[PDB]
Enzyme design. Sequence first.
Site, PDB file in Angstrom:
ATOM      1  N   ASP C  83      -0.438   4.542   4.193  1.00 34.87           N
ATOM      2  CA  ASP C  83      -0.708   3.275   4.868  1.00 34.87           C
ATOM      3  C   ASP C  83       0.080   3.160   6.168  1.00 34.87           C
ATOM      4  OD1 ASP C  83      -2.555   2.456   2.988  1.00 34.87           O
ATOM      5  OD2 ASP C  83      -1.084   1.375   1.773  1.00 34.87           O
ATOM      6  N   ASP C  96       3.370   1.789   1.714  1.00 39.09           N
ATOM      7  CA  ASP C  96       2.061   1.727   1.078  1.00 39.09           C
ATOM      8  C   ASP C  96       1.758   0.287   0.694  1.00 39.09           C
ATOM      9  OD1 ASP C  96      -0.109   1.675  -0.667  1.00 39.09           O
ATOM     10  OD2 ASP C  96       0.203   3.659  -1.426  1.00 39.09           O
ATOM     11  N   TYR C  97       0.473  -0.058   0.669  1.00 47.67           N
ATOM     12  CA  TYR C  97       0.033  -1.425   0.423  1.00 47.67           C
ATOM     13  C   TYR C  97      -0.765  -1.514  -0.872  1.00 47.67           C
ATOM     14  CZ  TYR C  97       1.190  -1.985   5.380  1.00 47.67           C
ATOM     15  OH  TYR C  97       1.833  -1.998   6.597  1.00 47.67           O
TER      16      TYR C  97
END
Lengths: 98, 62, 147, 62, 125
Positions: C83, C96-97
């Site tokens: 991400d 990261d999402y």
Amino acid sequence: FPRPLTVEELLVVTFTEAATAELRGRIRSNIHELRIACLRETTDNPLYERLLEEIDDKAQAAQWLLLAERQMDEAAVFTIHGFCQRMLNLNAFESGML
Amino acid sequence: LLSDLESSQELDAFVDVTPDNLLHNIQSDILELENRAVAGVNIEEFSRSDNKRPLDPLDSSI
Amino acid sequence: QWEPVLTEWITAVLQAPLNETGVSLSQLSARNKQVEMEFYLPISEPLIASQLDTLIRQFDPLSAGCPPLEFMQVRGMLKGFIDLVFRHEGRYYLLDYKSNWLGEDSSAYTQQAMAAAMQAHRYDLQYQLYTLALHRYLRHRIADYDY
Amino acid sequence: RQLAPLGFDLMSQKPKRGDRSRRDDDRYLFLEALISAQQKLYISYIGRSIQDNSERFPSVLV
Amino acid sequence: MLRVYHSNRLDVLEALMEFIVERERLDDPFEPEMILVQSTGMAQWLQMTLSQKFGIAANIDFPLPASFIWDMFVRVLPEIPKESAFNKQSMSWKLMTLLPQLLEREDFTLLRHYLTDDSDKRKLF
């Protein structure tokens, strides 16, 4: 004919689609046989023999048949219904068609 | 158009294809830019067919 | 109906400090920003589940929960989407999402509960494979790199 | 693959060097596929139609 | 300096591209590697071949020559929009406007016979 022509400028119309593909390969084979006959300057067939008698310069004629052999893919042999479809889609505005 | 560039520096690396199979025979002739087709210009060349390239019957390449 | 509730919550995400250094997302310049990295990580020998999780569970405390990972033998290239990747104070990070969580709002996101869902969705191996990727990329791109 | 020009297009009337036509693209693709094969080359086509049992023909490139 | 690499097969050029990146490594880590490809499959083959040697392939931009050069326009010359005002899409709607206005201009009269017959606006589109 007043001037020599290009394969793409010759129009052949045959009503059956199966005959248009056979005539395309029949002409494709006859251009290949005459081209080799022009390079060999001799041939075993009467028709190609009478053609070589009328040929003035066989070297330039063999180059024309070579360019005619490479263009046989776009060679135009169409049906009546396959012609109008390609022609009306060529110039749209005169026909007034999508 | 590539050879028309004035300031371009062109360098070539070409791996020679040793002809063995029918496939490597054609890639050769296209690479070395040669015509291997026998037109049979004269009857002396039109008779003997040995001047062509020998083809093995076991070649599945082409 | 959303936008009034969105533009606020977005500011709360960008202004939140991260880890120990307290890095805020708004402090990152576009020079240090790399968004949506697609990496190809080749695996040479066939990767066996049992031959992997034993090494995982060894050094990783998070791999103690849940049974061992179950996947067929695979040999080839590995794909993934990072991400965000950024550097701060000469130190790279990995971001990261995740959203999900249909039913929870309040403190049900916590240090024990977030790691509990990391083991539930098997995000353990995900960042372990993301780090091996990033480690190889930093080793390849940066001259004289140390982990 | 036959893609005809719009017919009022001016580029097809006076071609230039870097003009791209779909006919020359597929003709050059057959050459790219010929050099790309390092071992075996497979070319297949329908010689005879299975319906009426008539004669067909391969592409001029083949 | 613009360099042109000629080769018989692509595997030699791909190996040469591997040597160029290997001999000289970019200072900035986050600077992507610009590689021009006309399709997706060609780019996806370069990624698997580059990752097979270096060990990974990451941060490689694969734009089109039209998008690349246009992206080069915004960087070199200021005031250019990131995306242009003339595209295969927007120019269709812009012409759908002017064309009813440009009829009977003494020039377009050849085009006027195609439209003014009748339409649902499909012919205009």
